[PDB]
Design an enzyme around this catalytic site. Structure first.
Site, mmCIF file in Angstrom:
data_model
loop_
_atom_site.group_PDB
_atom_site.id
_atom_site.type_symbol
_atom_site.label_atom_id
_atom_site.label_comp_id
_atom_site.label_asym_id
_atom_site.label_seq_id
_atom_site.Cartn_x
_atom_site.Cartn_y
_atom_site.Cartn_z
ATOM 1 N N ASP A 193 0.784 -1.177 -0.081
ATOM 2 C CA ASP A 193 -0.154 -0.091 -0.018
ATOM 3 C C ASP A 193 0.951 1.403 -0.054
ATOM 4 O O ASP A 193 2.120 1.266 -0.230
ATOM 5 C CB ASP A 193 -1.008 -0.123 1.202
ATOM 6 C CG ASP A 193 -0.251 0.194 2.377
ATOM 7 O OD1 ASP A 193 1.074 0.452 2.719
ATOM 8 O OD2 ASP A 193 -0.905 0.387 3.657
ATOM 9 N N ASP A 195 1.370 4.965 2.171
ATOM 10 C CA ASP A 195 0.887 5.429 3.602
ATOM 11 C C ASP A 195 1.291 6.867 3.601
ATOM 12 O O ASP A 195 2.351 7.154 3.335
ATOM 13 C CB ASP A 195 1.516 4.798 4.670
ATOM 14 C CG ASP A 195 1.249 3.410 4.663
ATOM 15 O OD1 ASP A 195 0.445 2.819 4.906
ATOM 16 O OD2 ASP A 195 2.414 2.589 4.410
ATOM 17 N N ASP A 253 -3.477 4.467 2.506
ATOM 18 C CA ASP A 253 -4.050 4.946 3.738
ATOM 19 C C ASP A 253 -3.800 6.547 3.944
ATOM 20 O O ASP A 253 -2.539 6.771 3.879
ATOM 21 C CB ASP A 253 -3.210 4.210 4.830
ATOM 22 C CG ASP A 253 -3.683 2.829 5.061
ATOM 23 O OD1 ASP A 253 -4.697 2.414 4.286
ATOM 24 O OD2 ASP A 253 -2.982 1.778 5.588
HETATM 25 O O1 UTP Z 1 -3.855 0.835 11.411
HETATM 26 C C1 UTP Z 1 -2.660 0.949 11.230
HETATM 27 C C2 UTP Z 1 -1.871 0.291 10.284
HETATM 28 C C3 UTP Z 1 -0.611 0.496 10.379
HETATM 29 N N1 UTP Z 1 0.366 1.036 11.337
HETATM 30 C C4 UTP Z 1 1.838 1.207 11.312
HETATM 31 O O2 UTP Z 1 2.086 1.806 10.061
HETATM 32 C C5 UTP Z 1 3.162 1.273 9.546
HETATM 33 C C6 UTP Z 1 3.002 0.957 8.042
HETATM 34 O O3 UTP Z 1 1.934 0.183 8.260
HETATM 35 P P1 UTP Z 1 1.926 -0.934 6.844
HETATM 36 O O4 UTP Z 1 1.289 -2.289 7.130
HETATM 37 O O5 UTP Z 1 1.642 -0.107 5.675
HETATM 38 O O6 UTP Z 1 3.580 -1.630 6.694
HETATM 39 P P2 UTP Z 1 4.597 -0.960 5.568
HETATM 40 O O7 UTP Z 1 4.493 0.269 4.841
HETATM 41 O O8 UTP Z 1 6.080 -1.170 6.633
HETATM 42 O O9 UTP Z 1 4.777 -2.260 4.760
HETATM 43 P P3 UTP Z 1 4.388 -2.611 3.168
HETATM 44 O O10 UTP Z 1 3.164 -1.574 3.058
HETATM 45 O O11 UTP Z 1 5.289 -2.477 2.307
HETATM 46 O O12 UTP Z 1 3.971 -4.115 3.433
HETATM 47 C C7 UTP Z 1 3.786 0.321 10.605
HETATM 48 O O13 UTP Z 1 4.562 0.668 11.585
HETATM 49 C C8 UTP Z 1 2.390 -0.132 11.203
HETATM 50 O O14 UTP Z 1 2.398 -0.762 12.413
HETATM 51 C C9 UTP Z 1 -0.572 1.672 12.348
HETATM 52 O O15 UTP Z 1 0.041 2.225 13.436
HETATM 53 N N2 UTP Z 1 -1.869 1.765 12.480
HETATM 54 MN MN MN Z 2 2.546 0.405 3.916
HETATM 55 MN MN MN Z 3 -0.870 1.041 5.557
#
Ligand code: UTP
Ligand code: MN
Ligand code: MN
Length: 329
Positions: A193, A195, A253
């Site tokens: 995804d 973020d 997100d």
């Molecule tokens: O609802 C959430 C989702 C995610 N997070 C936090 O946001 C960060 C990003 O969460 P991600 O699941 O997007 O992981 P990532 O970007 O490291 O990995 P990929 O997308 O490449 O698979 C992680 O540190 C997670 O704990 C939250 O705090 N709350």
């Molecule tokens: Mn991510």
């Molecule tokens: Mn995410």
């Protein structure tokens, strides 16, 4: 090498990818069975290997490493001697693991939902589509777009998405900022995804920004799914990303934080998930403070730490600063 992943740099690329991949299969499988202790143990061992400066060619190189107990050592021993670990291959081949991986990968499906479905005799994506009353609207959308959502998100996709999000944020509210977080901020070339963390330098000016952003994106045909949640205001979305001759659904997100909480939110959302777990455990166990994405709380004094930056938080916890590209625990 120190005990906590937040006390050591873990770079993006390393020398032990076969070994860490195998330990991470065992961790994941543990999580699927609700074995949370074992998940953490295998995750920690894998993260040690990611921090090593050289490949592990013989088991002697294990010597002196923390979080490398008998089980993880055994796994690595089999891989070094025989080129394969039978416990790992049995997990890979198992219907339980394959189905739990299939289901949990779908947008909006966690372990408890995936396990329920498994126990109820569901195995395939078509099985889920035959039972639409069992699905949330988010899950329906994850199924509709599952092929694209299984396709790694690329840096080129991130750059295009950041442009449309920045444009929408800028038009809705001059001054508001967009920061890329998650794995891509850590230097990753691909992801599941994208973020983004949104704020404005004047506290409170972020109120009602996200629905205006979403309206702008929707009227450009860029949104396939969104779920707005009033915890930070956040929208977990599927974007329709145009591409040359086609398009691609991509999970995005969007998180809004008031500027006072921005450093804590950036730290939490940048990850890695294990890095942040370790940082929070370190803060509690070693410094007696409770860290989360909103703040750093001293439970004895009943006080919240004022931070302007991630560097402030590291400094306050007595940790050497690690830039995001060294947080790949
Ligand atoms: O609802 C959430 C989702 C995610 N997070 C936090 O946001 C960060 C990003 O969460 P991600 O699941 O997007 O992981 P990532 O970007 O490291 O990995 P990929 O997308 O490449 O698979 C992680 O540190 C997670 O704990 C939250 O705090 N709350
Ligand atoms: Mn991510
Ligand atoms: Mn995410």
């Amino acid at each position: 090498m120190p005990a906590y992943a937040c006390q050591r740099p873990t770079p993006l690329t390393h020398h032990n990818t076969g070994l860490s991949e195998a330990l991470e299969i065992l961790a994941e499988a543990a999580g699927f069975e609700g074995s949370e202790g074992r998940l953490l143990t295998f995750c920690r061992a894998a993260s040690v290997l990611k921090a090593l400066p050289s490949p592990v060619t013989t088991l002697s190189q294990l010597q002196g490493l923390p979080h490398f107990g008998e089980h993880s050592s055994r796994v690595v021993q089999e891989l070094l001697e025989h080129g394969v670990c039978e416990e790992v291959e049995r997990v890979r081949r198992s219907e339980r693991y394959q189905t739990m991986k299939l289901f949990t990968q779908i947008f909006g499906v966690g372990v408890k939902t995936a396990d329920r479905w498994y126990r109820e005799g569901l195995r395939t994506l078509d099985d889920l589509r035959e039972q639409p009353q069992k699905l949330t609207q988010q899950q329906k959308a994850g199924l509709q777009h599952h092929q694209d959502l299984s396709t790694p998100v690329l840096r080129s996709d991130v750059d295009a998405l950041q442009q449309v999000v920045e444009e929408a944020v800028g038009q809705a509210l001059p001054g508001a900022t967009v920061t890329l977080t998650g794995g891509f901020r850590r230097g990753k070339l691909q992801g599941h995804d994208v973020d983004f963390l949104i704020t404005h330098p004047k506290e409170g000016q972020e109120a009602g920004l996200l629905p205006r952003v979403m309206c702008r994106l929707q009227d450009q045909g860029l949104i396939l799914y969104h779920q707005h949640q009033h915890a930070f205001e956040r929208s977990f979305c599927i974007f329709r990303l145009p591409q040359p001759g086609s398009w691609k659904a991509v999970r995005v997100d969007l998180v809004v934080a008031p500027v006072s909480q921005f450093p804590f939110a950036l730290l939490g959302w940048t990850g890695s998930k294990l890095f942040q777990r370790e940082l929070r455990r370190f803060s509690r166990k070693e410094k007696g403070l409770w860290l989360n994405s909103h703040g750093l709380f001293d439970p004895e004094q009943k006080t919240f730490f004022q931070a302007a930056s991630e560097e402030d938080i590291f400094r306050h916890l007595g940790l050497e600063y690690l830039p995001p590209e060294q947080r790949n625990a």
